[model samples]
Target: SNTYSMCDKTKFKWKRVPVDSGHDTVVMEVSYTGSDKPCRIPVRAVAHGVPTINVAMLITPNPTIETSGGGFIEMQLPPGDNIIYVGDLSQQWFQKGSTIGR
Candidate 1:
């Protein structure tokens, strides 16, 4: 006799909402496109300007969870032109659910 197995897969959808606070806050929502199984979702943003922070620095409010209150990225533009990239917090030393760190 021969046996066959089936594979279950789920699609993940994410949404980013910006906060109105002085700082920049983005809310990331991860939902399963089909099944209800949870997915390991990651959120990030790309900003091209000046004074760039780590990629992982945009997660706001609730860093651990998908939804974040708000966050911010400081930019010190020069006289001419510069490029900056803002997204997930590059510095992971601080865990989720804690206050902002310097």
Candidate 2:
């Protein structure tokens, strides 16, 4: 219910957007809070002090963006729609519309 921490230069942004229920899903906007239907938003990633990717994400009912250090986790994808998975988190896996910028 409450597990949040982000530090990797700290402008934490996620991509993959474009949805109208057309099915080629890729809408992942995370910036962490919770609950409207599907829950579980646990995240902890720190650097220079160590400790990364302490993950737990299972989000569904979208549309949320409030301020003040926490409360923003949006995920609308084509990966199963509900109990979506990603645990022992290793990065680099893209194929819905690949684009990794810097």
Candidate 3:
């Protein structure tokens, strides 16, 4: 399942977008009992692409492992949230052999 994707670069110019959504917008939200209290995590999908990928990542972060705030999960604006594409999608935002971001 690993083949070196992105093959690209960014300073997160693709910050998420906002949608004035409906019931269909809320894909679903779940409480991660894997950790402490009932802090429900969110899940959503961005339909603005060829591949519609709905993702929910369960990251269990033990402080002893990663002291840098442990395993952090990026939960954007939920339901009405989306990934917006901005910045220079043209030539030489970075020349060949240049890249950034995860």
Candidate 4:
């Protein structure tokens, strides 16, 4: 059973796009190498330097990004060194879709 996913580890690109409204802040476009079957991609930020939010925060969406080969997300950084990590469905809470829970 080759239950492993090809979309693992090598599944995203980063770029800054201009939002029509304003650019006072900035928009980071997280380009995801999406999936074929329904699945959950849990992504999080690892911001470095001062004023870190890694302690208690979710920089991206809850329930995660769920779709095919163009799934994307946008986020604003607080001007510092930041990193991203995408989890394949082997972690504690990751599932192909919502299952039995309370």
Which has the greatest TM-score? 4
How far residue 43's Cα lies from its native spot in candidate 4, in Å, is 0.5
lDDT of 2 by residue, 1-102 (tens): 333222322333343322334444433434322222222333322222223432222244323333422334333332221232222222322324443332
The predicted structure with the larger TM-score, 2 or 4, is 4
Q: Which stretches of candidate 3 lie over 4 Å from their true place?
A: 1-31, 48-102
What's each prediction's clash count? 13, 1, 1, 0
TM-scores, all candidates, are 0.30, 0.20, 0.19, 0.39
- Give the poorly placed runs of model 4, Cα more than 4 Å off: 1-36, 50-60, 63-67, 88-102
For all candidates in order, the CA lDDT equals 0.29, 0.31, 0.24, 0.38
User: Model 1: per-residue lDDT, tens digit, 1-102?
Assistant: 112111122233333323224433322333333322222333333323323443344433222221221223222222222222223322112122333232
Worst 10 residues of 1 by lDDT: 1-10
Q: After superposition, how far is residue 10 of candidate 3 from its true place, in Å?
A: 24
Q: For model 3, state the Cα shift of residue 95 in Å.
A: 39
Candidate 3, 7: how far from true, in Å? 29
Would you give me the overall lDDT of model 1?
A: 0.29
